[PDB]
Structures are given as C-alpha cells and as structure tokens.
Design a protein around this ligand. Structure first.
Ligand code: HEM
Ligand SMILES: CC(=O)N[C@@H]1[C@@H](O)[C@H](O)[C@@H](CO)O[C@H]1O
Ligand SMILES: CC(=O)N[C@@H]1[C@@H](O)[C@H](O)[C@@H](CO)O[C@H]1O
Ligand SMILES: CC(=O)N[C@@H]1[C@@H](O)[C@H](O)[C@@H](CO)O[C@H]1O
Ligand SMILES: CC(=O)N[C@@H]1[C@@H](O)[C@H](O)[C@@H](CO)O[C@H]1O
Ligand SMILES: OCc1cccc(O)c1
Ligand SMILES: [Ca+2]
Length: 595
C-alpha cells in the first residue's frame, strides 16, 4: 500500500451502532473498519496484481512484452481453439436444473460488479475503439486472429473497455491498479434493493406508507407485478425489438435484463418483497413505511443467504464444501468480508453451465405455444417476450423442468454466448463472452494459473505431462500449451474451468478453493448474517429454516406444481408435487406486540 490508505471517493457515512438494519451501501457492517464490504471500494487483492508494467498495463497490451518469456495468446484465439464447440446434443447436466445456472448468476450479481470505465459519454474514442479497433487508454480491443470467421463479417476486433478503478478514473502511478466493486460484498439482496442511495429510493414506492417496492404501471402478469421500466434511452431492450417498444426493467442491479431468465428471477424477488411487506402490515398494522420496507428487506436477504448456503453451494463445491465452508461458528469481526478480484473470475464458471436454448412450458409442462423453445441469443435484453408472450409462469416452469448445461472439457461455452453475445451500445449479436472473460482477466491484472494453484496448496505443473495429469486430459493440455507455452501463463478463468470437477460438485479443486474461501468469508465476516445471534430471534430462525425456491415460486406465480428440491434435475409429473406439499414461511414470529 504505497499510500497507507487511498480513499478520496466518499470516505464519509455516519455509523448508527443501534441499527438492526444494514445500510444500503454496506458501510458500517464491520464496526472497527466500517468501509469493509461496502460498495464502490476496491476489490480485495488476495495476491499482488500482475501487470506487464507492475502497475496497470495488462499482459497482452504490448506485442513485444512477454509474460515469463512468452507472448500471451489472443483471448479470441483461446476462445476458438479451446472454448468453442458445435454439437449441443448430449451437453446437458443430467442432475442440475436450469435454475442451478440461474441462481448462480443471481448470487454473482449480489456480490460483485466491476463497471466498464466512465471517462466520457460523448466520445470520439468510442468510435476509435469500435470502428477502428485502435488500442489506447481505456479501449483494449479484442483482436480477431487470422482464420476467424468473424474477420469476414464483423471487421478486425470486438470492442472492449477497461474496468473502472479507484482514486478513480484518469490514470495514476501509485501501488497497482485496483478495480472497483460497485455492489455490496455482503449477500444481502443488493440486487433487488440497490447498493447506492439514489437507486434504492428510486426503486421504493414512497407514494404510500406500505414499504412496497415500486412496480410497473403499464404491464401486469395475471394481476401479479413486474418491475418498473427503466425509461432512460438508449435502452437495449428496446433496441433488440423496436416494434414492441418494451424497455428494460429497473432493478437493484443494473444488469437485471441481460437475459430473460435473470429478469424472471428478479421479478420473483420483487414480488416476494411486496408479498412480505403486505403480510407484515397485516400482522403489524401500526408499522410505518420504513420499518415495513426494512423488515421485508431483512427477510429477503436471509432467504438469499439460506438458498445459497444450504441448497446451492453444497452442489457446486461438493466434497470440498466441508473443507472450506464448515458449520457456522458465529460472526467474526477479524474476517475480511470483501469480494476478491479473483473471485469475480472464479464465479464465472457459470458461463460453462448456460445451455443454448430457453423453453416456455405450459401447466402440463409441455411446450407453451408453437415457438416454445427459443435460441438463447434472441433473449439477451429481451423483456418483450415476458410482457407480450405469456408472462413469468412459462419461463419459471422451464427453469424447473429443463437442465443446466454440464461443463465439458470439449464443449465449454455455448456458441450463443461465445459468438452471439449482445452488448448494449454495440449493435450486433456478435460478441464472445469467453474472449471477454480472458481479456478481463488481463485487464484486472490476474496472477496466472500456477500462482493460484500455489495459493490453494495445489501442485504447480510445469510440463505438458504434468498438465495432462492435473487436467486428466492430454488433448486439452496440449491445446492449452500450444497457446500458452507454460502453464504459468494460463489465464485463471480458463485454467480453473479446465480442471475436472470434484466429486458431487460442478467445479474443480482450484475453483472450489477460491470459491470456498470467498463464501466462507462473506458468511463469517457479515455482522448481519441471518444465523448470527441477535439478527433474528430463535423463533424467526426456525421459520426461516424452511424457506425454499419452490415456495418462492408457489407464492409469487400461478405455478402450482413444483419439485421439493428445485436445483436437481426434475421431470414432470414424477418429480413434481402440489404447492400444498411444500413448507410455508411462517411469519407469525414477526408479529410484534406493544403496550
Ligand atoms: C445467459 C447467462 C449469462 C450471460 C448472458 C452473462 C453475461 C455476462 C457478461 C456480459 C459479463 C460481463 C463480462 C465482462 O465485461 O467482463 C458477465 C460477467 C459475469 N458473469 Fe455472467 N452471464 C451469464 C451467466 C452467468 C452465470 C450463470 C454466472 C455464475 C454462476 C455468471 C457470473 C458472472 C460473473 C461473476 C461476472 C463478473 C461480474 C463482475 O464482478 O463484474 N454469469 N456475464
Ligand atoms: C440421481 C442423482 O444423482 N441424485 C443426486 C442426489 O442424491 C443428490 O442429493 C442431489 C443434490 O442436488 O444431486 C442428485 O444428482
Ligand atoms: C409506482 C407504483 O408502484 N405505485 C404504486 C401504486 O400503483 C399503488 O396504487 C400504491 C398504493 O398501493 O403503491 C404505489 O407504489
Ligand atoms: C424481430 C422481432 O423480435 N420481432 C417481434 C415480433 O415477432 C413481434 O410480433 C413484435 C410484437 O411484440 O415484437 C417484435 O420484436
Ligand atoms: C474464534 C475465531 O473465530 N477465531 C478466528 C481466528 O482463528 C483467526 O484469528 C481469524 C481468521 O483470520 O478469525 C478469528 O475470529
Ligand atoms: O450480465 C451482465 C451484463 C452484461 C452486459 C451488459 C449488462 O448490462 C449486464
Ligand atoms: Ca450484495
């Protein structure tokens, strides 16, 4: 830390100490160090950043600057040679529902967001990046290799802008550059409520003292609500269909409409808040607008924590879950709650779980209409298919009855993401998420694969033969070394994902360690963790223990047949029960007496 502490962007915020509620920003969770875990601060560095100049220049920036004596391969070349595949047949995960992928994305958005840098709206440099592909300042274009089909139809590169960093936004020459996490590190439903005071208030309904979240006033789903529209233009949800004129949703997190199933789960979560807020007011008529909002917010936060740690993590981490996330032993004010920079790449394992299509299903869980199944690329920034084509129920049924993609060393990332990605402001369904990930690895100054293996106590292969053994795959290891020339240079996103999965899990040993450590930290380092004594009464906890995603579905949609365990692969009718067989959330313990 060249300076003993760089913090010019908001160092301020008075701490309450008497508050039973979290701040919107995450400040004041940790009493000794109140900025820890708060939004718009640097991502934590678990290892020192690795830049070609030691400070800020990404590896790959200068042709003539090697990493460990070898040129780094183009991100898109790695994507084409390693990450892509043609045949979608046989790629699905026979024991994870599509909800498993989807919940991952939700959790991710709760924990981290490193926004692409600001520096200007009215930019000649935007054209310079996109139209001319000239690298400079925050433009760091993804150059196509020779033989790339995209060279024939899309020009010479994909645009790419470097992430924002603290002391923030023009270049500085201090300790190494740290990217910003714009959301709260805590698992706290910041994706529903926001991590900033402007947004958080804009999302609430302050026209009535009921503690409700604002809802769309233009469209309804069989009498159930949608999020408000975002009426700032240009709107990518309008751009993908200028006939329908259906804008993006507005949600605690700016990414909520990135694809239709994310927007779908966001809508469920908004619905749950208002459902909770209405029950609380009925149970506690005296309660004012603020306390309703806050008590509802507190419950929803616990919901996300429980679903995540009880149901989701054990089937991601499998046999490693015990080793990294043992049983909760209480809040620990020494633990660093911040999301680490590497975690934002590790958690991108979910990209390899996204399948190539999305289905709308009817009440018999048969295809909903003649175009029930849609290619995923037509569903980026697509809100019109929700509002104009059956609402949420058909998509939720698909989330329950369809499968996630299985990660596969020879079928890594679906072409829907790898060749067809839509990015707002750019006009085409023509980007490559895997190339973006790799380029972003470099932008953030990530240490390589072997540095992370050492970090996790795992062997550091230096040879082809050693890499074959770690990957349990000769052909993959050989492709990777042909590109990277030393395992020391393999980008963490691809190195971590290339490892065979652990038993009963869906990530390899390296990622399980990285993810495992991070999740242990956001639990043990959270003063408002749901199971921390003082946060919820014992009675409130016994009620919270029975939450489930199936119950979330049942309460907030007109889906009446659900599985007991919604993350595993479930088939209809054999694996589905009526909602009456699913435990309710008993909110009687929130009844507050007075007098
Ligand atoms: C159809 C599904 C998905 C799409 C279209 C999508 C798209 C994207 C895009 C465009 C980015 C920003 C890339 C960059 O500029 O660096 C991103 C980042 C990310 N994605 Fe996804 N993604 C999807 C699913 C998932 C899943 C399933 C997970 C995890 C289980 C996940 C985790 C992440 C994470 C951790 C980041 C980095 C967030 C940050 O700190 O800024 N994504 N994704
Ligand atoms: C048929 C089968 O493999 N069932 C397992 C089940 O034992 C396990 O508890 C569950 C966790 O989600 O994952 C399933 O794949
Ligand atoms: C923008 C918005 O959501 N306005 C709703 C309004 O439609 C509703 O009638 C009122 C009272 O229940 O609560 C407001 O929040
Ligand atoms: C290219 C495209 O997606 N066109 C759809 C069209 O099929 C639909 O009838 C219309 C009305 O919702 O919305 C448009 O966006
Ligand atoms: C009782 C307890 O939790 N002790 C741990 C201790 O092992 C360690 O010093 C630190 C982890 O960095 O967190 C403390 O709270
Ligand atoms: O899912 C992340 C994402 C990606 C691109 C644009 C967005 O607004 C959000
Ligand atoms: Ca959060």
């Amino acid at each position: 830390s060249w300076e003993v502490g760089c913090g010019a962007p908001v160092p301020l915020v008075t701490c309450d100490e008497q508050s039973p509620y979290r701040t919107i920003t995450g400040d004041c969770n940790n009493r000794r160090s109140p900025a820890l875990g708060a939004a718009n601060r640097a991502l934590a560095r678990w290892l020192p950043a690795e830049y070609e100049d030691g400070l800020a220049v990404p590896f790959g920036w200068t042709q003539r600057k090697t990493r460990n004596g070898f040129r780094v391969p183009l991100a898109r070349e790695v994507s084409n040679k390693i990450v892509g595949y043609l045949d979608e047949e046989g790629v699905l995960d026979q024991n994870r529902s599509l909800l498993f992928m989807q919940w991952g994305q939700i959790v991710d958005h709760d924990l981290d967001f490193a926004p692409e840098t600001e520096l200007g709206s009215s930019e000649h440099s935007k054209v310079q990046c996109e139209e001319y592909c000239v690298q400079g300042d925050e433009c760091f274009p993804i150059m196509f290799p020779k033989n790339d089909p995209k060279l024939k139809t899309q020009g010479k590169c994909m645009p790419f802008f470097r992430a924002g960093f603290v002391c923030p936004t023009p270049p500085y020459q201090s300790l190494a550059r740290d990217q910003i996490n714009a959301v709260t590190s805590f698992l706290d439903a910041s994706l529903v409520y926001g991590s900033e005071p402007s947004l958080a208030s804009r999302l609430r309904n302050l026209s009535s003292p009921l503690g409700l979240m604002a809802v769309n006033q233009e469209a309804w789903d069989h009498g159930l609500a949608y999020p408000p529209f975002n009426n700032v233009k240009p709107s990518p949800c309008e751009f993908i269909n200028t006939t329908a004129h259906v804008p993006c949703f507005q949600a605690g997190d700016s990414r909520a409409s990135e694809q239709i199933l994310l927007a779908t789960v966001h809508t469920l979560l908004l619905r749950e808040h208002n459902r909770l807020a209405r029950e609380l007011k009925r149970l506690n008529p005296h309660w004012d607008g603020e306390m309703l909002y806050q008590e509802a917010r507190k419950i929803l936060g616990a919901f996300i924590q429980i679903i995540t740690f009880r149901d989701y993590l054990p089937i991601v981490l499998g046999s490693e879950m015990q080793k990294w996330i043992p049983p909760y032993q209480g809040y620990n004010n020494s633990v660093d709650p911040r999301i680490s920079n590497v975690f934002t790449f590790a958690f991108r394992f979910g990209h390899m779980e996204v399948p190539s299509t999305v289905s709308r299903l009817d009440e018999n869980y048969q295809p909903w209409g003649p175009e029930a199944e849609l290619p995923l690329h037509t569903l980026f920034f697509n809100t019109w298919r929700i509002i104009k084509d059956g609402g949420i129920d058909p998509l939720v049924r698909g989330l329950l009855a369809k499968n996630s993609k299985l990660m596969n060393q020879n079928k890594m990332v679906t072409s829907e993401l790898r060749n067809k990605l839509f990015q707002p402001t750019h006009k085409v369904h023509g980007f490559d998420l895997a190339a973006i990930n790799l380029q972003r690895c470099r932008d953030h100054g990530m240490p390589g694969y072997n540095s992370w293996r050492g970090f996790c106590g795992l062997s550091q292969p230096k040879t082809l033969k050693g890499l074959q053994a770690v990957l349990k795959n000769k052909v993959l290891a050989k492709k990777l070394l042909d590109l990277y020339k030393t395992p020391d240079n393999i980008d963490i996103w691809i190195g971590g994902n290339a490892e065979p999965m652990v038993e009963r899990g869906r990530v390899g040993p390296l990622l399980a360690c990285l993810l495992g450590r991070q999740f242990q930290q956001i639990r043990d380092g959270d003063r408002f963790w749901w199971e921390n004594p003082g946060v919820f009464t014992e009675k409130q906890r016994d009620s919270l223990q029975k939450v489930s995603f199936s119950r979330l579905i049942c309460d907030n949609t007109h889906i009446t047949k659900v599985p007991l365990h919604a993350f595993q692969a479930n088939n209809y009718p054999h694996d589905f029960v009526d909602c009456s067989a699913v435990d309710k959330l008993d909110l009687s313990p929130w009844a507050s007496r007075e007098n």
